[PDB]
Symmetry: C5
C-alpha cells in the first residue's frame, strides 16, 4: 500500500534482528558458506492504528498487501534468499511486528595465512530500499540477535555474533542508502592437526638423519632418497584437505624448508663419500660429526624464526 505519511518528520525506524539456527558447508576455495536463520522486523505507523475498543488483546490482523512492508535485501549473496513469511501483527499504536525465515549462500573473504591456528570473521550486509514520502533508517534490536545452541560448524567453534549499530551511510547510483553489518567470529580447532600432519612429518625427517651415523654409501643413498619420496607422498596426502590458496602460508613455508634440508643432506652425503674415496677419512669424519649436531640446531632456529615472523 502507500508508505507512511510524511507528517511525522522522523525516519521510519526498523528494529532488525538475526537469529541463527545453523551454519553449514563452509567452503574454503569459493570462500562461501550457507546459513539458516530467522529475521525480525518492527516499525511503527500511526496511519494504521488499532482501537482499544475492538479488543484488549491488541487485535493484530495478518494483512497481505494491506500494509506497507519495508523490504530487506542482502548484499553479499549469490542468489536471493528463500524467505518464508510466518506472521505479521499490528500493535494498538501501529507498531507493526514482523517475522521471517531464510536460507542463503553468503560470499565472504577468508585469510588462510595462519592456516592451522587462524581465526575468521564472517560478514552479512543489509540494506533497506528508500521510499518517496518518508525515510527509513535501520536499527539493531539486541533482544533478537542471537544464535541457537544447535549451530554447529564442522571444525570450528563460535565465539560471538554481534551487529555494529552504526550504519555506513553512502550514496550509490545517485541514491543514499544505509547498511548493517553482522559479524560472526569463529576459531579453528587445531589439536587434531598435530598427530595427523605435524608429528609423522617430523618422524620422517628424523629418519633421514640416521645417515650421519653410517659410512655406507649405498645405505645412505637409499635412506635419503626413499625418505624424500615418502615426504612427497605425505605432501600428496596432506594437500587433499588444504584449501587451494594462491598466496603464502605458514605450512607451505615449512614444506619448502623441509625440501631445502633434504637437498643439503644429499649434498653432505655426496661430499663425505667423495672425500673418503680420495683417501682423506679424517676430514670426512669431522664433517659428519659436525653435521650430526649442526642439522637439528639449524632446524630449530629456522622454525623459531618462522613462527616469530608469522605469529608476531
Amino acid at each position: 500500500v502507500s508508505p507512511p505519511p510524511p507528517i511525522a518528520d522522523e525516519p521510519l525506524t526498523v528494529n532488525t534482528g538475526i537469529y541463527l539456527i545453523e551454519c553449514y558447508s563452509l567452503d574454503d576455495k569459493a570462500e562461501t558458506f550457507k546459513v539458516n536463520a530467522f529475521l525480525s522486523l518492527s516499525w511503527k505507523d500511526r496511519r494504521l492504528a488499532f482501537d482499544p475498543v475492538r479488543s484488549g488483546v491488541r487485535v493484530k490482523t495478518y494483512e497481505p498487501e494491506a500494509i506497507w512492508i519495508p523490504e530487506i535485501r542482502f548484499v553479499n549473496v549469490e542468489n536471493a534468499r528463500d524467505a518464508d513469511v510466518v506472521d505479521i501483527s499490528v500493535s494498538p499504536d501501529g507498531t507493526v511486528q514482523y517475522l521471517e525465515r531464510f536460507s542463503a549462500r553468503v560470499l565472504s573473504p577468508l585469510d588462510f595465512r595462519r592456516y592451522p591456528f587462524d581465526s575468521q570473521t564472517l560478514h552479512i550486509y543489509l540494506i533497506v530500499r528508500s521510499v518517496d514520502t518518508r525515510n527509513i533508517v535501520l536499527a539493531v534490536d539486541l533482544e533478537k540477535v542471537g544464535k541457537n545452541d544447535d549451530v554447529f560448524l564442522t571444525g570450528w567453534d563460535i565465539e560471538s555474533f554481534t551487529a555494529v549499530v552504526k550504519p555506513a551511510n553512502f550514496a550509490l547510483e545517485d541514491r543514499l542508502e544505509s547498511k548493517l553489518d553482522y559479524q560472526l567470529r569463529i576459531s579453528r580447532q587445531y589439536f587434531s592437526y598435530i598427530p595427523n600432519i605435524i608429528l609423522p612429518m617430523l618422524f620422517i625427517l628424523f629418519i633421514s638423519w640416521t645417515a650421519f651415523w653410517s659410512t655406507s654409501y649405498e645405505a645412505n643413498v637409499t635412506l635419503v632418497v626413499s625418505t624424500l619420496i615418502a615426504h612427497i607422498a605425505f605432501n600428496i596426502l596432506v594437500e587433499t584437505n588444504l584449501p587451494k590458496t594462491p598466496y603464502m602460508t605458514y605450512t607451505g613455508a615449512i614444506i619448502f624448508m623441509i625440501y631445502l634440508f633434504y637437498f643439503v643432506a644429499v649434498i653432505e652425503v655426496t661430499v663425505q663419500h667423495y672425500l673418503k674415496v680420495e683417501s682423506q677419512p679424517a676430514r670426512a669424519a669431522s664433517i659428519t660429526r659436525a653435521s650430526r649436531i649442526a642439522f637439528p640446531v639449524v632446524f630449530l632456529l629456522a622454525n623459531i624464526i618462522l613462527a616469530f615472523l608469522f605469529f608476531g
Copy 2:
C-alpha cells in the same frame, strides 16, 4: 478459511505420523541426508460437520481453500520440502483426515569417534504455527509411524524409528511453539572393514619386523623404509573413504601408533649397526634378541589400552 471457533476451549489436536519410503545419500562431510516419506494429519472441527442424511459412506469432500488446514514446517532442513498433497477427507463429526508426500534434505550431527563400529541417531524436528482464535498442540499417532521394507541405506542397518510423544514447549521471538522429535537409530556394518583395511595393514607391519632376524644393514634399511612408503600409500588409499573429521578418532590413533612404531624400528636398526661396527657384537645380539619379543607385546598392550579408552 477461518480457524476453528474458540468455543471448544480444548487446543486443536493434530495426530501426526511419518512413514518412511527410503533413506538415501547419507553424506558424512556435510552431515546431511535426504529422505522420502509420507506425512499424515488428523484433526476435528465441529464447525464443518457432515450430516448423516447426505450419505452413510461419510461423504468427505476434497476442499481446497474451503477448510482450515494447519501447516507444518520442518526445522533442520536446508530447503522447504516438496509436498505433494494427495487427498483430504472430512468425517461426519468433522474429524478431517490428511495425506501428503515430501522429499527433504535434513541436517543432523554425526559423531565419527568409534568410526568403524559406531551407531548414529538422526533427528527430524516438527513445529506447528499458532493461530489467533484457537490453539494447536501436536500429538503422535502410533498407527501411522513406520517404515517400508524398501528403506535401504548403503552400509547401514535400521534398528528403530520412534517419535517422542512429549513436545518441547518453549518461547521464541515472543511466541510459544511446540516441537516434535523423530529419531532413527542406525548401526554401521563393519565386517567388510577388517579384510579391507585392518588385516593388510597388519601384514605390512609384520613384514618390517623380519629385520630383527638379520644382520645385513642394507637389507634392513630397504625393508623398513620400503614398508614405510607402503604404509603411506595404504593410508592414501584408505583416506578416500574416511569422512574428513576435524577431531579425534580410533582409526587415526592406530595410525599414529603405527608411525611411532616405525620410527622406533629405524632407531633400533641404526643402534644395532653402530654397535656392531664398534666391535661389540654381543650387545647388538642381545638388543636384537630382546626386540624380537619386545615389539609385539608392546603393540598388543597399546592396542588393548586404546580399545579400553575408546570403547569403555
Copy 3:
C-alpha cells in the same frame, strides 16, 4: 471435472505403457539412474461420448479441465517427474487416449557381489489415486511397452523390458491402492576388465615368484617389497572405478588373497636366509625347491574354490 458415473459398476480400466528413449547416468554409489521415456494411457467414459454425426474421423477434442484425467505417480523417485503433455483424444464411445513424456531420477537397489560378471534388475513403480464415485484399476498394454534402439547405457547391454500384469493390491494409510512393476534386465560387458585389471595383476604377482630361483638375500627383498608397493599402487588405480560397497565382493576376496600370498612369500625368503646363515644349506635348498611348485598350485586351488563359492 467430475469422475465417471458409478452406474457402470466396472472399475475404470487404464491401459498403461512405458516406451523408453534412453537410459543414462547409472550411478553406483547412490544406486540411482535417470530415465527418459513416453507414457501412454487409455480409458473409456460413456459420460463424454462423441456422436458419429459430427464427423466420421471421430472428432477428438483436446480438453483441458473439461475431462476427468486419472493422475499417475511414481513411487521410487527422488522428485516428481517432468511431464510434458502432448495430446489427448476422445473416441466416439468415449475411450479417451492420452500421451505424455517425462524424465525422472529413479532409486533402485544394486547388488555388486559378482561385480565383474553381474546382472541387475531395475524397477519402476506406478500407483493410481483412488476416486470417490468409481474405482480405477491398472492394466498393461503390450502394444505400447517397448524401447528405442537409441537406448544406450555406458557399459551395459539391455536384455528385456517387461511389465508384470499383476498389481500388488495392499492397504496403506487406511486406503487401498494398486501397484505396477516395470523391470529392466541389464548385463555388464566384462571383456575389457580382463586385460585392464586381471592380467597385469597376475603379471605383477608372477614377477615376485622369481625369488624362489635365487639365493641373494638383497635381491629377493628388493623383488618382493617392490612388487608389494606395485600391487598397492595398482589397487589405488583400480579403486577409482570400483563403486564403494560396504559388503563382500569377489574382487576384494581376490585382493585379500594376494595380500596373504605376499606375506607368506616374505616369510619364506626370511626362513631361507636364516637357515643358510646357520650353515644348513640342504634344508634351505629343499624348502625353496618345494615352494617353487607349492605356490602356483595353492593359488590355482584357492581361485577355483572362490569361483565355486561365489558363482555356484
Copy 4:
C-alpha cells in the same frame, strides 16, 4: 488460436534453421554436451493476412495467443530447453516469421576407439506435433543454418554443421511424425598428446632396456622393477584425463603391450642370472646379446600391427 484452415490441401511448411552461438562442456562419461543457439521458423497462413493499405512496411504485429504457433520439441534432451521468445512478425500474405533462443543439454553417443586421433558426429533431433485440420511438415532453410566464429570447444575443431533435408517419417504410438537431423562434425586436436603422454612413456620403457648391457643381478632387478613402478604411476597420472570406457581402445592395447614386455624382460634377467650361476656364461652371453636386438624389433612390429588393426 485455431490452426490454419484445411482448404489449402498443402501441408503447412515450416522452414527451420539453427544458428550456433557456443558449444561448451563436452562430457565424455555421460556422453552429453550443452549448447546455446538461436532457432528460426517461418510459415504461411492466408487466414491471417495483412492488407497493403495499412502500411507499405508490412505491419507485422507481435501476437501472443492471437496466432497459431507450431511448437517444436527436441528428442535427445534431458530437460526441455530454455526458450526465450524474441519477436514474431506477419508478412502481407501471412508468411509469419519467428525467432527464439535456447540452451539445452543434449545426449549423443561417442566412440572412443581411436581415442587420441578420433572424430565424432553430434546429433540434434527435431519433431513437430501434428494438428487436426491441416498437416505440418518440416523443411530446412539453408540461409539460417550456421555457426558463430565465437563457437569454441575446449580441445576440438569444428568442421561442418549441416542438416539432412530428408525427414525420417515413421509412426509412433498410433501417430505419424516427422524428424529433422542436425549433424556437427568435430575432430580432436592431438598434437599435445605426444609430448604429454607418448614420449615420456617410451623414455621410461627405453630406460629398462639398459639392463641387457650389464651382468649385475642387483642393478638389473632395481632397474626393471623401479621402472615398472614408474610405469604404474604414469598410468595413474594418465587415467585422470581418459574418459572411463567399458570397451576396447588403442591406448589400452598399447598399455597392455607394455605390461607384457615388462614381464618378458624380468623373465630374461632371471634366466641370465640362473644360467650364469650354473657355470654357463657363454649361453647367458648369447641370450643377452640376442635380446638386445630382439626387443626393439618386436616392439616396432607389434606397434605397426596394432596401428594397422585399429586405423585400417
Copy 5:
C-alpha cells in the same frame, strides 16, 4: 505499453552502466565465471512527461506495465540472469531512470599459454531488441561503470574495467542489432608458484646430478631411477591445480625437457659403466668429467631459449 512516438526521428538512447560487486568462481576447464553486479539504464520519452506544477521534487512514479521499458539481453551467458528490479523514476521532461541487479554465469575464452605469468581479458556482451515505431541505440555512461573495493578474485588482481563506446553494428536473421563490449583485465599472482612448484623441482633435478661424482654403478642407478619416480609423483601432485589444456604450455615444455634430461643421464651412466668394465677407465673418467660441466650449461641455455620463444 506503446513505444515512444516516431516523431522524434532520433533513436532512443539508453545510457548503460555496469557496476561490479564481486567476481567469484573463475573456472578454468569450462572457462566460465560467475558475476554479481548492478545495471543502470536511462532514456528520455517526452510522451510521458511530468508537469512541474505537481511537485518541485520531480514526482517520479514507479510504473509497472505503465511505461515502455527497453529490455536488455546478455549474449555469452549459459542462462538468463537473475534480475531484481529495484526502482524506476521519471524526470520532468521524461528522462526515465532505471536500476537492477543480476547474477550470471558468463562464458569467455581463456588462454593458458604463459600459464604461471599470464593475463586475461573477460568479456560481457549486451544487445538491445529493436522496436517498430522508433529506434534504440546503446551508449555508455562513464559515471556508472565501476567496481566495488569488495570485488576479490581468488588468485587474481584487477587492473581495469572499461566499456568500448563503439557498438558493433551487424545484421543477424534479417535484423540489425547493436552490441556493447565490457572488458575486465586481470593478472595472475605468480609469487607463490616459485617456492611451491619451481624450486623443489630444481632441487630434485640437482640431486640426480650427484651421480657424475661417483663410480658405483648400483648407487648411480638407485639415484637416477629413484629421482625419476620422485619427479613423476611431483608431476602427479602439480597436475591437480593445472587446468586441463588441450594445447601447448610453457610448463609442459619444461616438464618434457626434464624428462629428456633424465633419459640422457641414464644413458651416460650406462656408458660409463660399460666402458669401465671393458678396461678403459681413462675414457670413462673423461666422459664423466665432461658431463659434470656439460649438463647445467645445456640446461640453462635450453631454458633461456624457451623463455625467449614463449615470452618474446
